[PDB]
Amino acid sequence: IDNFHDDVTLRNQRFIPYTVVLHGPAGVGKTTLAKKCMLDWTDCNLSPTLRYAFYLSCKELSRMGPCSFAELISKDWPELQDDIPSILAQAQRILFVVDGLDELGDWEKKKPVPVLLGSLLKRKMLPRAALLVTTRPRALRDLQLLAQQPIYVRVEGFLEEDRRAYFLRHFGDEDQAMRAFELMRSNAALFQLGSAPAVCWIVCTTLKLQMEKGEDPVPTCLTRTGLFLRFLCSRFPQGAQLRGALRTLSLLAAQGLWAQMSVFHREDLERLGVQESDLRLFLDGDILRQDRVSKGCYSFIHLSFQQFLTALFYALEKEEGEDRDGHAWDIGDVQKLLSGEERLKNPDLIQVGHFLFGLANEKRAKELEATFGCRMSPDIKQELLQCKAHLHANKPLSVTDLKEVLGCLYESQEEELAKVVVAPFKEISIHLTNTSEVMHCSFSLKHCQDLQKLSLQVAKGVFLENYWARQDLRSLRLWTDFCSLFSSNSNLKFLEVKQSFLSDSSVRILCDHVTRSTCHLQKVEIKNVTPDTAYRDFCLAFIGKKTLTHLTLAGHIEWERTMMLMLCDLLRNHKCNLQYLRLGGHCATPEQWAEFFYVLKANQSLKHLRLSANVLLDEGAMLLYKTMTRPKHFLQMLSLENCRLTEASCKDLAAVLVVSKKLTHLCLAKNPIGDTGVKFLCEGLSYPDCKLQTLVLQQCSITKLGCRYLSEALQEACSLTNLDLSINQIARGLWILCQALENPNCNLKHLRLWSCSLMPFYCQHLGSALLSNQKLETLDLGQNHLWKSGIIKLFGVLRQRTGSLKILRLKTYETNLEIKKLLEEVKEKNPKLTIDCNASGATAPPCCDF
Amino acid sequence: EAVTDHPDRLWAWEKFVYLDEKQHAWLPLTIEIKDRLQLRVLLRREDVVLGRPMTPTQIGPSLLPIMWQLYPDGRYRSSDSSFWRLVYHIKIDGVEDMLLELLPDD
Amino acid sequence: EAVTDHPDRLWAWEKFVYLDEKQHAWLPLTIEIKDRLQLRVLLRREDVVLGRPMTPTQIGPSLLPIMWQLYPDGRYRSSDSSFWRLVYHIKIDGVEDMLLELLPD
């Protein structure tokens, strides 16, 4: 109704030789926009510069035979042909509009209509006019090859406010209108399709009819198929049992959808044997709408109704010998319909898929047969599962695929159909965005039994901000129903939550369900969750879990005393079975850290300990080291990644290394400790009783003096076997480490020099060392400039002997013949040596293993 | 007089001093023991000055937990993983009182 | 009536059960607290079957100690070196009861 389409078109028009293209989904009202622009031109509303405008429609021009453009445009206005030359003498004052492209030089030269349209679209005739094109996104491809430097404009259609206004207009009564609007909006999928005015018309008519009859509308809006089915049942006379008419309509809709055509002429209806008498019922029932501008045209009420009728065709029973008809129908089959390539080629079958799933129910078939008297094919339940390979990929399904499958299964509304499909799932990922998704997941996933992993995430807007009460209550109820997976499934063994905008009540419900004794979790992770009480509550809930053996916490937090209490009690307990603990972004004072490290002394199960991104200020670090010097500590691994460290504390670290008897790993990545710190540590390593076996110094800002210190330390009979250097460069001192490797007392097995800024001149040292050493078993070179000359020299040198080296990594180009020959020779003479030639990867080896 | 509101937390600011989520002070009066597996503790409300917050090392071992918390169904979870049940919560002479029990471990 | 006798020493046998040199079973029934330095506990003598000695590690931390000692002048020594006092020891209707107290340093 007026005052709304005008409201939309007024703002749409302002976004606009110029070439303008309009594109949007069907039913959004592009033709109304173009007609409004033309009317504004006629009414002098627009600028006076627009003196003439012409209307061209592919809906009609697709049939008229060859002629001249002047005659073509003057066909509808014969009186203007005398003025056509004068009008076209002012090309700069002319506006051209092409409506419905997808439905498809001399103005006085006769030519075919396609040629004329291509020439005008190419600006070969009347170049300085203005063009305006309306098309669906499906046919947008050709305009790219035809148009020159166009501009694209998008339409959107109604909004929530306009939907409410339309409902108020139609119902009239405030109570009825608002009740209906609420019932509709409760369904997100049906709400989205409400942008098109026709869909809102259908919904309002159906709900109003049901209300006037005193019927319950709740089941009607539960799913699309129920609503459309009810409307269709409520648009034909009783007692007729028009089986033939229903079959005819289904076939016609199917043909139309397959051929990608949106309009039909009387000739097309005649071709299919549609008796014109039936058009009375088809029209007066509002299934078909006759165009009142160009007589002899017809179209369906809206795209979704056409899709629904298409589905009704496929589920309808097929008669014997129907392949013998006199026409070769453009109809596929179920397997072709459900194929992915057909989906990509023709994006309009996706919705037919959902509707077909919805028609697999038994009650709907019963009601449809009773109302009309048709007969329903019973093999759909098996035909749908014959495409079950789409689901049995043997790999976890991506998020979008899982959403699609769950939506279809919910449409089906039959659990026996869901069981056979969701039985084999083994890993899952979820990304909730609104209530409907929560409801679908709850309905479907309760039947899983072998599920083993799960990754969760909640988007903003699902749970209302912390302070409407009923709106949040519905979400809370559905959340409580959804959180029963953890309690029921006793095979789940890994969880993860990340980047979720939760609220206190939801977190409390989740923890209540996680604390029961039917859950057997073994790993957990929390990352960037809000609000900030979530971390405290989770630390409280995971105390005493017999099975738990890993745990992670990350984000931005400040240590409130309550959090300190909980995070110390989590280790004080006697049921504790933890084996790995990580912390991130935790800021606290030295007193809290002191008491925490005091609590650690009693724990007798922890083995790892990570402190990435936490601030120690070096005072917590010195406290930690002074705690470890005691003779009864139990930690084995330890990592202080990026904790604001310097050379001040390294002396206590050396003391720990010399005195300790349990420490056997370490890591200090991302800390500019400095060559003095390296010197202190090396003084530590020299002691006979050192037991450290691994060490990591990735990106620690060390210079050649540190390399000399490392070589001097390694020259003795130490116990080190693994050493990892990267980012920090050892190029100038590389010969020092090569000399160290030459020493018989070395015991290194691995060595990483990823991105150490090395020059080809130094390949000689590495070659000699590798040819000499007896214990090295892996070397890692990357991001170096030795790609060509270094490859040549290293391969030549290593061709002489078969060293113990097993895995060697470096970056190469396999396009060179000489390098290929050298590599082949080396491989032949050293078949036990694997060489990685694709070290171009820009991801460094992390500290997870170490 | 019955009360329909319950506290959602009880920190331990000092030994025998608990503060709910509205910074009001609760003080424990007596502890009841009927047998090995039955323990019932009695909490009372009173306003008193607060000293420095004793830290966990200073608190030392105790029979009561460090922090309670309300869970749906109307049950508290202490900090030792055991569940405590709500017995009654009444007002007399303007004085708040509460009684809690220790349920057998599941 | 008041009874002069009293256990010389007390040892914990199970969770919330003690034994004296006579091996009588003394159990705690109620604990009354007025403040940190003022703590009271009640004891009663009952006959019950003793299980295996629950070693202190299994008993776990508790407000009560593992051992209680008695000295003249109303002086009691606990395992944690704290001092306690006896208020009354009486027998009424066949049940023997004892009350302890805590004395500020």
Side-chain angles (χ1 to χ4, degrees), chain A residues 1-13 15-22 24-469 471-616 618-734 736-809 811-850, chain B, chain C residues 1-8 10-13 15-35 37-49 51-70 72 74 76-105:
Chain A
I1 298 162
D2 304 351
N3 311 91
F4 297 170
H5 290 277
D6 302 325
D7 276 341
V8 176
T9 44
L10 82 86
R11 74 211 60 191
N12 272 239
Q13 281 176 115
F15 303 138
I16 318 162
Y18 289 93
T19 305
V20 175
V21 185
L22 294 164
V28 183
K30 309 185 286 292
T31 287
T32 192
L33 190 82
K35 190 265 288 182
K36 179 68 164 64
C37 274
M38 277 205 207
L39 290 183
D40 292 328
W41 160 72
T42 50
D43 313 328
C44 297
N45 308 340
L46 309 181
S47 170
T49 59
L50 296 166
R51 198 167 166 164
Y52 295 113
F54 293 70
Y55 175 77
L56 303 169
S57 76
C58 322
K59 183 181 183 176
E60 153 57 5
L61 300 165
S62 315
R63 282 156 37 259
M64 79 97 69
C67 69
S68 82
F69 187 72
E71 294 155 338
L72 187 151
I73 63 188
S74 59
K75 181 186 157 196
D76 305 321
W77 288 96
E79 301 169 15
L80 292 176
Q81 189 156 5
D82 304 330
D83 299 327
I84 281 293
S86 74
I87 292 153
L88 299 179
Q90 307 177 26
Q92 75 279 8
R93 292 176 167 161
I94 309 182
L95 169 61
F96 285 90
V97 175
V98 182
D99 205 28
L101 178 58
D102 44 19
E103 305 186 321
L104 185 73
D106 177 6
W107 45 83
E108 263 166 40
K109 198 167 182 177
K110 291 195 174 196
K111 285 295 197 175
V113 184
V115 171
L116 294 171
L117 285 173
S119 301
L120 201 150
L121 293 160
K122 221 157 181 172
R123 297 193 168 287
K124 190 178 176 181
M125 149 168 65
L126 298 162
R128 292 195 170 175
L131 304 185
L132 183 60
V133 187
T134 77
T135 185
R136 292 166 171 195
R138 189 166 177 167
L140 185 137
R141 305 179 319 296
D142 306 328
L143 283 168
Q144 289 184 172
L145 296 181
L146 274 164
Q148 286 184 355
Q149 302 183 355
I151 198 54
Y152 295 104
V153 171
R154 199 164 185 169
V155 292
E156 304 201 335
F158 277 24
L159 268 285
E160 182 177 0
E161 315 56 19
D162 258 315
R163 288 164 215 167
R164 162 165 55 263
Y166 202 118
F167 268 74
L168 282 157
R169 254 185 174 163
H170 199 92
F171 264 105
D173 167 275
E174 160 161 301
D175 175 20
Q176 297 181 356
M178 292 315 307
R179 180 174 169 194
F181 183 86
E182 196 40 79
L183 264 288
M184 157 174 166
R185 76 169 325 165
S186 82
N187 178 309
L190 174 56
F191 201 63
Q192 204 98 346
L193 256 61
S195 65
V199 175
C200 272
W201 191 92
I202 294 162
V203 174
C204 280
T205 315
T206 310
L207 283 177
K208 194 174 184 178
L209 281 165
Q210 276 208 289
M211 286 180 92
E212 291 152 291
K213 293 166 188 182
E215 310 316 325
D216 170 20
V218 175
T220 295
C221 278
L222 196 52
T223 54
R224 290 166 285 195
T225 317
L227 170 68
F228 281 110
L229 169 57
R230 202 73 163 163
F231 167 68
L232 176 51
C233 281
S234 307
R235 289 289 151 189
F236 275 147
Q238 282 199 0
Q241 292 209 350
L242 299 166
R243 179 175 177 185
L246 186 40
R247 304 191 51 81
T248 295
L249 182 64
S250 45
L251 178 64
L252 166 54
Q255 146 178 348
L257 186 65
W258 268 113
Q260 319 171 40
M261 310 190 9
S262 55
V263 162
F264 308 90
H265 304 154
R266 214 281 295 260
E267 291 82 9
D268 296 310
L269 310 184
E270 175 190 347
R271 286 169 38 213
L272 288 144
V274 185
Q275 311 305 339
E276 214 146 340
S277 39
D278 294 327
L279 296 200
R280 292 169 197 167
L281 266 39
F282 281 15
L283 293 155
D284 282 82
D286 292 311
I287 302 165
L288 289 172
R289 287 188 158 197
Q290 62 196 127
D291 186 356
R292 299 174 184 193
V293 170
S294 65
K295 293 179 179 177
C297 307
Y298 307 92
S299 50
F300 267 118
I301 179 164
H302 189 234
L303 183 61
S304 97
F305 214 68
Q306 195 160 354
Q307 283 162 337
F308 168 92
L309 285 165
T310 299
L312 200 74
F313 162 66
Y314 280 104
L316 242 184
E317 190 191 48
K318 300 186 177 187
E319 204 221 8
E320 306 165 339
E322 267 187 300
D323 300 314
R324 307 166 181 166
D325 286 346
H327 299 271
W329 309 122
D330 303 66
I331 70 195
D333 216 17
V334 180
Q335 276 110 311
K336 343 302 181 183
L337 187 148
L338 291 158
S339 71
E341 65 277 33
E342 207 69 37
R343 286 183 154 204
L344 208 155
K345 194 172 162 70
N346 191 348
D348 296 321
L349 299 164
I350 291 176
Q351 187 63 35
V352 182
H354 299 353
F355 281 129
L356 179 57
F357 252 99
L359 277 163
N361 186 304
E362 290 287 339
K363 172 173 295 315
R364 285 163 191 153
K366 152 65 92 164
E367 181 173 358
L368 190 87
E369 287 197 342
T371 308
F372 287 128
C374 63
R375 285 161 162 269
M376 294 300 293
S377 167
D379 295 341
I380 189 74
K381 211 153 177 165
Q382 168 62 310
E383 294 161 11
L384 292 171
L385 297 167
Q386 294 240 57
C387 308
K388 174 168 160 192
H390 182 62
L391 324 167
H392 276 223
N394 316 326
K395 317 181 286 293
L397 295 77
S398 77
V399 185
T400 317
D401 273 27
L402 187 56
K403 275 187 190 206
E404 145 190 309
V405 172
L406 293 167
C408 295
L409 285 175
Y410 186 72
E411 290 270 335
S412 77
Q413 287 284 310
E414 274 202 11
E415 303 194 330
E416 287 78 349
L417 188 69
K419 271 184 193 171
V420 177
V421 165
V422 307
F425 287 153
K426 281 191 184 179
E427 309 194 4
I428 289 174
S429 173
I430 311 181
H431 182 307
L432 305 165
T433 57
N434 66 66
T435 315
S436 204
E437 305 216 72
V438 168
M439 177 171 350
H440 298 165
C441 291
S442 86
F443 167 88
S444 304
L445 280 174
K446 76 191 165 188
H447 297 295
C448 293
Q449 287 184 359
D450 197 55
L451 182 55
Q452 284 199 2
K453 177 165 173 309
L454 172 60
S455 170
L456 185 59
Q457 168 165 356
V458 190
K460 181 172 178 146
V462 177
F463 290 115
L464 163 65
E465 275 54 69
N466 309 294
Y467 296 154
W468 47 268
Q471 184 186 356
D472 216 57
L473 275 162
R474 172 151 154 283
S475 294
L476 263 282
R477 190 175 92 208
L478 291 172
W479 181 252
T480 303
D481 269 345
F482 166 78
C483 279
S484 78
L485 315 188
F486 306 110
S487 160
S488 165
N489 189 302
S490 73
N491 278 309
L492 183 59
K493 286 170 184 183
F494 184 15
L495 164 70
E496 173 178 52
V497 186
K498 56 188 172 206
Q499 306 182 323
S500 324
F501 295 91
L502 301 173
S503 63
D504 42 5
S505 294
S506 61
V507 175
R508 202 153 296 221
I509 287 164
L510 170 54
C511 273
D512 176 8
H513 272 289
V514 152
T515 189
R516 290 192 185 185
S517 66
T518 73
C519 173
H520 290 119
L521 279 162
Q522 282 188 353
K523 308 202 209 306
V524 183
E525 304 190 12
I526 313 293
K527 300 175 191 150
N528 312 351
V529 176
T530 61
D532 274 8
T533 68
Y535 300 93
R536 176 196 66 211
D537 174 45
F538 281 130
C539 273
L540 176 51
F542 286 129
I543 304 195
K545 264 279 181 188
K546 289 186 178 186
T547 62
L548 198 66
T549 78
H550 285 60
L551 177 55
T552 295
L553 304 165
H556 288 217
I557 318 91
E558 81 296 20
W559 268 32
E560 151 56 50
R561 161 148 169 145
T562 304
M563 184 102 180
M564 189 260 256
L565 292 173
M566 291 305 78
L567 190 46
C568 288
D569 169 88
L570 185 141
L571 288 160
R572 172 177 303 184
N573 196 299
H574 64 82
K575 281 184 190 172
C576 188
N577 198 16
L578 223 66
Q579 282 193 31
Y580 172 104
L581 180 49
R582 164 172 177 175
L583 306 164
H586 295 269
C587 55
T589 79
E591 296 73 7
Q592 300 147 320
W593 281 104
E595 258 194 357
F596 177 63
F597 294 136
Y598 181 90
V599 157
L600 248 180
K601 215 189 287 270
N603 200 279
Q604 288 212 2
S605 318
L606 205 63
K607 281 182 189 173
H608 302 276
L609 177 56
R610 271 181 80 154
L611 296 170
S612 40
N614 318 68
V615 313
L616 267 42
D618 287 11
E619 194 39 285
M622 271 156 288
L623 290 152
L624 200 162
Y625 302 158
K626 278 176 180 176
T627 313
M628 216 149 298
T629 170
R630 290 274 303 277
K632 315 305 263 171
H633 219 51
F634 298 99
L635 256 175
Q636 291 191 1
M637 145 178 172
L638 172 62
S639 195
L640 303 170
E641 174 175 349
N642 185 14
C643 294
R644 307 278 71 201
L645 289 202
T646 89
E647 68 193 38
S649 52
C650 289
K651 197 173 178 180
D652 294 283
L653 216 168
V656 153
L657 280 186
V658 59
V659 172
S660 183
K661 303 290 193 187
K662 289 283 197 183
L663 188 71
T664 70
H665 287 66
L666 182 61
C667 186
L668 294 165
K670 276 95 164 144
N671 283 283
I673 52 176
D675 308 319
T676 313
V678 180
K679 162 57 141 48
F680 283 129
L681 294 180
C682 283
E683 283 179 15
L685 272 156
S686 95
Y687 207 72
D689 71 31
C690 177
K691 303 299 183 198
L692 186 77
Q693 276 182 342
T694 300
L695 175 61
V696 175
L697 292 167
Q698 171 171 358
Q699 195 174 348
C700 309
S701 304
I702 295 168
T703 82
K704 284 23 189 189
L705 190 55
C707 305
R708 193 159 289 101
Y709 285 134
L710 284 179
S711 265
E712 284 168 11
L714 269 277
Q715 274 155 249
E716 315 318 323
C718 86
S719 316
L720 210 78
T721 69
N722 196 324
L723 161 63
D724 161 68
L725 305 164
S726 294
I727 300 103
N728 64 34
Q729 297 137 226
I730 66 142
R732 314 181 81 61
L734 188 134
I736 318 172
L737 281 153
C738 287
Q739 195 288 331
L741 288 174
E742 154 170 31
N743 191 311
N745 317 331
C746 172
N747 288 320
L748 267 198
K749 285 197 177 199
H750 314 251
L751 173 60
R752 291 179 188 157
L753 296 170
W754 191 72
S755 193
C756 261
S757 314
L758 311 179
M759 261 313 96
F761 153 67
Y762 304 92
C763 283
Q764 171 185 351
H765 316 292
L766 275 184
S768 179
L770 260 65
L771 287 172
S772 309
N773 196 273
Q774 310 288 308
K775 282 174 189 164
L776 204 142
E777 280 201 17
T778 302
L779 178 60
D780 197 6
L781 299 164
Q783 320 310 293
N784 308 280
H785 317 78
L786 62 80
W787 155 71
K788 170 55 160 26
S789 38
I791 272 180
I792 293 154
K793 187 153 191 168
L794 264 180
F795 282 43
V797 170
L798 297 167
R799 155 77 182 263
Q800 301 158 17
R801 206 184 196 179
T802 50
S804 325
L805 201 173
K806 286 213 177 49
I807 297 174
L808 177 63
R809 189 170 108 212
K811 76 206 301 289
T812 85
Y813 266 69
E814 296 191 323
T815 54
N816 189 283
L817 181 56
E818 181 46 290
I819 283 170
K820 281 287 298 211
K821 212 61 51 173
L822 281 165
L823 170 59
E824 290 301 309
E825 292 283 338
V826 165
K827 271 290 298 195
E828 174 62 296
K829 281 202 176 184
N830 193 343
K832 295 99 191 169
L833 155 54
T834 299
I835 278 154
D836 177 11
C837 297
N838 301 343
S840 47
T843 51
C847 326
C848 300
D849 174 302
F850 290 58
Chain B
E1 321 192 63
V3 177
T4 57
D5 155 43
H6 308 307
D8 288 291
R9 257 169 294 171
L10 299 172
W11 308 287
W13 188 265
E14 284 192 342
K15 202 136 172 181
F16 327 110
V17 188
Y18 288 94
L19 330 177
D20 78 344
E21 85 299 38
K22 204 43 51 183
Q23 282 83 342
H24 307 136
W26 297 79
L27 281 193
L29 296 177
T30 78
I31 305 172
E32 227 188 352
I33 297 173
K34 288 184 180 182
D35 214 355
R36 284 71 153 170
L37 287 157
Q38 303 300 348
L39 181 133
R40 318 176 95 227
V41 76
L42 150 65
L43 281 171
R44 152 160 287 187
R45 156 63 86 71
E46 187 273 359
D47 251 20
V48 79
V49 285
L50 309 174
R52 300 176 192 194
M54 294 287 266
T55 69
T57 305
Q58 312 276 9
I59 297 172
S62 47
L63 215 168
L64 288 84
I66 278 164
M67 184 171 101
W68 273 284
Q69 177 150 51
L70 182 66
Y71 268 25
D73 159 4
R75 287 193 306 181
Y76 293 130
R77 184 168 222 256
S78 57
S79 155
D80 181 65
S81 77
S82 305
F83 271 99
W84 294 68
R85 174 165 71 91
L86 172 140
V87 191
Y88 70 73
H89 172 204
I90 83 153
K91 284 193 321 313
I92 202 172
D93 298 307
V95 165
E96 281 295 29
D97 192 334
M98 193 202 283
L99 178 57
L100 295 186
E101 170 169 89
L102 197 185
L103 291 172
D105 211 2
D106 189 72
Chain C
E1 71 295 19
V3 178
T4 61
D5 307 3
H6 39 252
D8 261 325
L10 279 160
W11 297 275
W13 190 256
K15 156 170 292 201
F16 311 140
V17 175
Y18 290 87
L19 294 176
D20 56 18
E21 65 278 352
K22 153 65 212 70
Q23 311 201 316
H24 269 169
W26 292 78
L27 288 87
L29 297 181
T30 322
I31 306 201
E32 312 149 14
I33 270 169
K34 299 171 186 183
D35 262 307
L37 305 161
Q38 254 297 284
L39 183 139
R40 315 169 103 231
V41 56
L42 249 172
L43 280 57
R44 181 160 299 178
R45 155 42 181 180
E46 161 185 340
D47 199 75
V48 294
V49 180
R52 73 172 61 269
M54 203 147 171
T55 196
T57 313
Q58 332 160 277
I59 271 171
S62 170
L63 289 169
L64 313 174
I66 278 161
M67 193 284 307
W68 266 347
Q69 207 257 318
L70 188 158
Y76 284 65
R77 150 172 271 286
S78 47
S79 63
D80 63 339
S81 306
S82 303
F83 291 177
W84 308 72
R85 169 174 74 173
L86 163 63
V87 162
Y88 66 74
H89 165 174
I90 71 188
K91 183 178 188 154
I92 291 170
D93 299 308
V95 305
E96 293 153 25
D97 290 330
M98 205 140 61
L99 181 39
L100 275 279
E101 285 206 278
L102 201 40
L103 155 61
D105 305 69

